[PDB]
Amino acid sequence: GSHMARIASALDNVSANVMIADNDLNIIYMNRTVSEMLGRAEADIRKQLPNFDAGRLMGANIDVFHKNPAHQRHLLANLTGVHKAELNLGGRRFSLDVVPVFNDANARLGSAVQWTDRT
Amino acid sequence: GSHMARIASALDNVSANVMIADNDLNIIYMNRTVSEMLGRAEADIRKQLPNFDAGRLMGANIDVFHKNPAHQRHLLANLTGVHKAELNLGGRRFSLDVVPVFNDANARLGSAVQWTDRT
Numbered sequence: 001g002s003h004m005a006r007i008a009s010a011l012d013n014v015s016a017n018v019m020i021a022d023n024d025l026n027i028i029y030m031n032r033t034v035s036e037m038l039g040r041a042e043a044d045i046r047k048q049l050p051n052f053d054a055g056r057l058m059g060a061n062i063d064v065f066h067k068n069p070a071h072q073r074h075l076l077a078n079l080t081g082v083h084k085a086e087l088n089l090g091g092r093r094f095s096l097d098v099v100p101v102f103n104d105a106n107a108r109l110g111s112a113v114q115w116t117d118r119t
Numbered sequence: 120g121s122h123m124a125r126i127a128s129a130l131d132n133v134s135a136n137v138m139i140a141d142n143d144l145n146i147i148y149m150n151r152t153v154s155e156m157l158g159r160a161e162a163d164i165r166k167q168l169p170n171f172d173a174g175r176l177m178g179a180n181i182d183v184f185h186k187n188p189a190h191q192r193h194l195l196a197n198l199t200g201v202h203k204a205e206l207n208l209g210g211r212r213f214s215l216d217v218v219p220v221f222n223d224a225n226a227r228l229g230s231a232v233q234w235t236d237r238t
């Protein structure tokens with residue numbers, strides 16, 4: 001019944017770091033490699049985001065990590081295909097692959113995001 | 120359906136190198152990064168598989184690259200969760216994350232494989 005849960009379970013143990021957000025940009029799943037990766041990156045990320053806490057991402061909204069929350073919400077709300085954003089956080093480089101997820105009626109369910117730590 | 124076509128399309132442009140095989144172990148989709156990655160690794164892979172051609176992988180059966188094709192077929196047909204294999208090809212190391220793909224009725228459709236070139 002839940003497509004997001006099916007995708008999360010299938011991807012839980014793959015190499016690719018994958019985080020899944022719902023339509024409100026709440027983080028609802030993180031696979032094992034992404035949790036581990038963000039744990040390692042935590043020190044560096046704090047230099048720019050001092051209150052960032054990797055152990056507390058599940059159930060957090062991504063707003064809090066965005067200067068202008070209205071911008072990402074509009075972009076993300078309107079995605080028809082993959083969006084490749086590139087972030088520099090505290091000296092660390094990340095490529096994000098943002099993948100819009102739909103049901104069989106074309107109704108948007110949320111976003112699957114691949115993280116790649118380029119550094 | 121087609122669930123595989125949806126998956127292939129959603130992943131066509133992600134960073135993760137992804138290849139998709141059907142129930143008969145025919146390669147039916149390759150995303151962009153996996154094609155490029157296998158193109159770069161072609162010379163080395165030829166040292167061990169002299170007839171390997173990265174440009175001719177689409178539609179090929181993977182039997183041809185396996186010493187005991189019956190082994191992989193049995194293994195793959197029976198997967199319920201991710202299978203993590205490690206390959207050495209012409210001195211190159213690859214991690215494969217093999218993800219069994221099911222429809223919402225639990226009927227197996229094929230296999231999505233993430234490739235990572237560890238070298």
Ligand code: HEM
Nearest residue numbers: 019021057062065066067068072075085086087098111113
């Ligand atoms: C939860 C950890 C996350 C952190 C720490 C983080 C941090 C950032 C930062 C620092 C920026 C740059 C602008 C700014 O700082 O105000 C940014 C931009 C952006 N974020 Fe993320 N973010 C996270 C998760 C996500 C997720 C899950 C998505 C999408 C589903 C996303 C989508 C975007 C987009 C779309 C932009 C700007 C897009 C562009 O201009 O290309 N973020 N983020």
Ligand code: HEM
Nearest residue numbers: 138140176181184185186187191194204205206217230232
């Ligand atoms: C298309 C290019 C491919 C090449 C060149 C390749 C090559 C190989 C090689 C050399 C082996 C080791 C067995 C042996 O040496 O005979 C192997 C094993 C294996 N292959 Fe692949 N293969 C490819 C694609 C795929 C795909 C798409 C799948 C999954 C659908 C797959 C699944 C496996 C599995 C399951 C094993 C055995 C894993 C284990 O026993 O741990 N291969 N492959």
